[PDB]
Design a protein around this ligand. Structure first.
Ligand SMILES: CCO/N=C/c1ccc(OCC[C@@H](C)CCN2CCN(c3ccnc(C(N)=O)c3)C2=O)cc1
Ligand SMILES: CCO/N=C/c1ccc(OCC[C@@H](C)CCN2CCN(c3ccnc(C(N)=O)c3)C2=O)cc1
Lengths: 297, 97, 245, 48, 49, 245, 297
């Protein structure tokens, strides 16, 4: 039981996060109301104090004489799903006949969508994201030709054995999900759930994955968050003998059922590597165009 | 519950059964160390001998509390007091008791 | 009546006669973790007053040429007072923060500082200048501690992102002709209910001069910028021996 | 980690060494998600 | 020796807090575990063999 | 059903299959300080689970010739875990204690240990032998820390008082043929509501063999005596920098 | 407010100290009831387990066949006030004419009753004591003669100026309490309240009064508790000129309204010094008498 007063009256343990703001429905752009001349003292909408950290509350109505405008312009196309639920390229996998990369008829791709700028820049506008996704796989030769070849895509989650050859035992795929399809068939397509151990994926992690001394030789692990490492995507031509055709597999992703938290500045320097925000120090460019003088267009 | 091979060191066929049990004996009272092992259930090591560890291998993620029950098979006349500790992440192998 | 303020928490009190209101990050006050968001089963420890108090950790000198600085949370406090001890003895930690940045001058000095909080503030390197070398920042730069660290390329926040858009984060400005401090309240921000105070820095505090400090010869030239902060609703779990990293 | 709190004591006539058997399992709050193949494949060549 | 597993729980071994666990048990049903197509046979029909 | 016991507090649990009930010093359980007994006005901190847990601090070897040992509270814990940190950072401290002394042997060993708690256990010196020299005990003898200290003249408890009357204090015996442990619960004992954990030792724990350890050649000769203890209802106030003494 | 369960259900802050025992009135020794032979199994009052730490619960009734005895023997004389409220010697002050001690006609005595064994041993049976007291002052020459001399006793609390001579300004006693009396008058007598800053005086303090390094040269402060230092008792002959008579002042104390806590073993070795329990290491004697054999009286 509790008897001393400070304990009875403490707020220790309050799990209800008080919120200062709340969402209102806004299916259309706000309307404009009629306004007339105002010649007052005390009232001063135009003057602000940006230091406070809030944006101006001044509106058209109070800065100029306005008319009434019934605005029925929709706000639908700027929802998170509207913005992200559009399939974009996030991965390429080459299966050449004579090459230096994957000449053995199979390939392992670490699921990581940060290899392409268009898609990357869009998701990095937010820190945390949670979503399901639709993945489409487009295959063909390097000329775009369609050949009668059978492929096998297999999702190898962390801890499952990664195939080490075209005839690897792991292709038995008794538990992992695999897709068998022909380059002649339409692109393969499947739905993927939100698989992270966390409540959301995060495009930025200002930390280290393990404890201990973080000496020079381990600094490559700064920013590495296993909660984002969903596994490997393996592909192989189906046969004990080498394929007769050189192949390419393009991977497209379409997010759906999206939720995002913590907006952030948008990348303004070219990307260099998948794992980090490194930028070319000798080529730091302005965010946008420039001009000769501040008094000339 | 299944047998946890804490003593996973002997590897020759004729000594495999020794992995199923570890020893204790009269010491010098300096709070000496008896044994150690990672609690990680789906990791290579002792847990691999258990059915939990094996089934655990067919799933990518897990969540839950674990329990290890130690049975003393010494003679009825033997007595003793042991300290069994669990060190959460971040704590290196304890140097002393 | 919006210019004057008193912040009392624990055995510490702060006063200011030239404030500019208070910002509450993402519109929500710090709170303890609910039983439905929690996952770890051990009963947490909530030290209260011994750790939720104001700590004045560092003072930087604002110069006409200063580029700006940043600090990482909870890194700045991991070795200070009772809070530090709890962060060291426990695997799990969670809390909010009240940040109060101080900088006063005279009615004849000028300049403006942007004070902002950026969650998951990952630092990038200049990649060897040419961008052909995949270098990585060292521990003393990712987790600088109480002394903080000076920005090398403020325009891109040392991470390839425009500082001109930093205002999309909870922030305030210290415009010398207006106010002499900035107060920002931050709730716990993470994708997990609790996390390690040592391996993970939830957000970074940036203090960058956007309008340069200026004044005429004869006026006090030493213009300090002091950083005071207080944890709010600190909770700890997963007890064992103390660890520094 | 397992340490001696006091000591293993025995009288004259009883073995100075004994063994401990460890049994492990999961609690009722234990669950698993995202099915995957086990890390092992118990077969070298074709099974005839 | 009895042959039963320990009945000891977290609650009685350490001081615990309340945790509302909503983690599903669905993926460990027999159908979830087995209803995944796997290879069980290969048949060769060579020309010269 | 009085022989078996489990003591759970914090993240620690103790078991014993050969107990002899539990003693509650002066018949009263530890409790927090009421608002009418308190005097200091600052809000106290009550860490709870991070400090009210079992700490195993030392192991002594019981020998056929052992004279006995003693430990001072809270001295034994001032440098251990989170409790120690709080005792160091705060001027004021108060708490109770659960003491569990462990010592097992065989049904062929014999001997009896008197385990007792003596409040305000002031130590005296032999005054130069002749008693003409007014000497005083050194810091390492008044506050021995976790290693404790061995009694020089147990008959008079190193303080001119008869150990034969020590049973007037909360105590238990460890008679090898009967039990292998002693458990004593002690409430906060002082003439003040709070006090310094560093300058004042509220009570001393004495473990003295009254009936000598004995056994025949061949039986385990190493018979340890382990000291485990847990603070109860720990409260702290008067916060400032850490101090060791 | 409080919302998480562990906080709502915690006992943190309980100020009610649960007590396992309670006092019952006992104005007389317990009576004895009639008893007869008992020849049972299961019932065994005679067998105990001293290890538990409790005293035997066995009574006459269950060990022998008893008769009924109505015991009306009082327990009154063993109350704390009965035991302590008896005036005993606790201080002597000499004011000689020609001497090496106080030949200037005045003396300062630090209020400390531990200089005499009879009184000391009684109070040291307890650790904490709270009480009021009646102090009686008996004066006369060293032969016990009564001379026509006027004296001045003054209580100088900590911080008040201690007289440094027979003509010291402090004797103006404008605030401190002073008693002027003649050796010819009966012994002076006054009542003293409980003056400690603590809830009780304590005959034992296992600690140091200050912080810092407790090096060899400061070990004389171990066990010193200012809460027990009530001040100085100063005495002087009243006059600018030396007295014509040698004097002695015996101080007797009679406690009243006594409360005591925490009983402890009773001193069994001779006392040596006021401030501590030091004992002659080369003369440690048995608590009591001894004999030649355990089988002979
Ligand atoms: C027959 C079988 O067909 N199987 C198909 C199939 C397809 C796709 C699958 O997985 C989709 C998981 C995707 C959406 C997660 C992408 N994420 C989240 C966070 N993150 C990330 C964050 C910070 N940094 C980095 C970094 N690389 O530096 C990276 C990501 O890349 C699984 C299976
Ligand atoms: C005209 C004016 O007439 N004025 C008379 C008058 C007489 C007596 C007065 O004060 C009586 C206070 C007495 C009762 C307190 C005695 N105590 C309590 C604790 N303590 C003590 C504890 C541990 N150790 C020591 C030690 N010496 O090592 C010492 C004591 O000696 C004041 C005034």
């Amino acid at each position: 039981g509790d008897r001393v007063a400070d304990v009875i009256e403490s707020s220790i343990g309050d799990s209800v996060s008080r919120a200062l703001t709340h969402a209102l429905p806004a299916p259309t752009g706000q309307n404009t109301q009629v306004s007339s001349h105002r010649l007052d003292t005390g009232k001063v909408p135009a003057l602000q104090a940006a230091e406070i950290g809030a944006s101006s509350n001044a509106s058209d109505e109070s800065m100029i004489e306005t008319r009434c405008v019934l605005n029925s312009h929709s706000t639908a196309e700027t929802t998170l799903d509207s913005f992200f639920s559009r399939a974009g390229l996030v991965g390429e996998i080459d299966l050449p006949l004579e090459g230096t990369t994957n000449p053995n008829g199979y390939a392992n791709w670490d699921i990581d969508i940060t290899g392409y700028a268009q898609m990357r820049r869009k998701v990095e506008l937010f820190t945390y994201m949670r979503f399901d996704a639709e993945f489409t796989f487009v295959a063909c030769t390097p000329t775009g030709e369609v050949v009668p070849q059978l492929l096998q895509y297999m999702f190898v989650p962390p801890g499952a054995p990664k195939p080490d050859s075209r005839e690897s035992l792991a292709w038995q795929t008794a538990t992992n999900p695999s897709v068998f399809v022909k380059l002649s068939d339409p692109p393969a397509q499947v739905s993927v759930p939100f698989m992270s151990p966390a409540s959301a994926y995060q495009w930025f992690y200002d930390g280290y994955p393990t404890f201990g001394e973080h000496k020079q030789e381990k600094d490559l692990e700064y920013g590495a968050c296993p909660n984002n490492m969903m596994g490997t995507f393996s592909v192989r031509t189906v046969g004990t003998s080498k394929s007769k055709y050189p192949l390419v597999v393009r991977i497209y992703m379409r997010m759906k059922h999206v939720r995002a938290w913590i907006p952030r500045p948008m990348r303004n320097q070219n990307y260099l590597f998948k794992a980090n925000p490194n930028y070319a120090g000798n080529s730091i460019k302005p965010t946008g165009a420039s001009r000769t003088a501040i008094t000339t267009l | 519950e299944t047998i946890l091979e804490v003593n996973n060191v002997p590897t020759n066929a004729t000594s495999l059964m020794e992995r199923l049990r570890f020893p204790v004996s009269a010491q010098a009272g300096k709070g000496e160390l008896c044994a150690v092992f990672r609690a990680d259930p789906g990791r290579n090591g002792p847990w691999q001998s258990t059915l939990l560890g094996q089934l655990c291998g067919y799933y990518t993620q897990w969540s839950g509390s674990l329990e290890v029950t130690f049975m003393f098979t010494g003679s009825f006349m033997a007595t003793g007091k042991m300290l069994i500790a669990y060190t959460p992440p971040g704590g290196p192998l304890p140097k002393d008791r | 009546s919006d210019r004057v303020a008193q912040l009392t928490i624990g055995n510490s009190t702060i006063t200011t006669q030239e404030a500019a209101n208070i910002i509450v990050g993402y519109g929500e006050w710090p709170s303890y973790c609910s039983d439905s968001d929690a996952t770890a089963v051990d009963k947490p420890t909530r030290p209260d007053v011994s750790v939720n108090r104001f700590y004045t950790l560092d003072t930087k000198l604002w110069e006409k040429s200063s580029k700006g600085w940043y600090w990482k949370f909870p890194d700045v406090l991991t070795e200070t007072g009772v809070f530090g001890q709890n962060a060291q003895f426990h695997y799990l930690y969670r809390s909010g923060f009240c940040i109060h940045v101080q900088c006063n001058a005279s009615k004849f000095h000028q300049g403006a500082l942007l004070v902002a909080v950026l969650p998951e503030y990952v630092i990038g390197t200049v990649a060897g200048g040419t961008g052909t070398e995949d270098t990585h920042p060292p521990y003393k730069q990712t987790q600088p501690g109480a002394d903080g660290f000076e920005l090398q390329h403020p325009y891109v926040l040392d991470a390839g992102i425009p500082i001109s858009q930093l205002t999309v984060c909870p922030h305030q400005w210290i415009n010398l002709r207006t106010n002499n401090c900035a107060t920002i309240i931050v709730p716990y921000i993470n994708a997990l209910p609790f996390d390690s105070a040592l391996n993970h820095c939830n957000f970074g505090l940036l203090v960058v001069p956007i309008s340069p400090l200026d004044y005429d010869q004869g006026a006090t030239p030493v213009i300090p910028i002091t950083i005071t902060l207080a944890p709010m609703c600190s909770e700890f779990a997963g007890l064992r021996q103390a660890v520094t990293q | 980690s397992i340490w001696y709190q006091t000591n293993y004591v025995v009288p004259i006539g009883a073995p100075n060494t004994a063994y401990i058997i460890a049994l492990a399992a999961a609690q009722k709050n234990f669950t698993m998600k995202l099915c995957k193949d086990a890390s092992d494949i118990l077969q070298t060549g074709t099974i005839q």
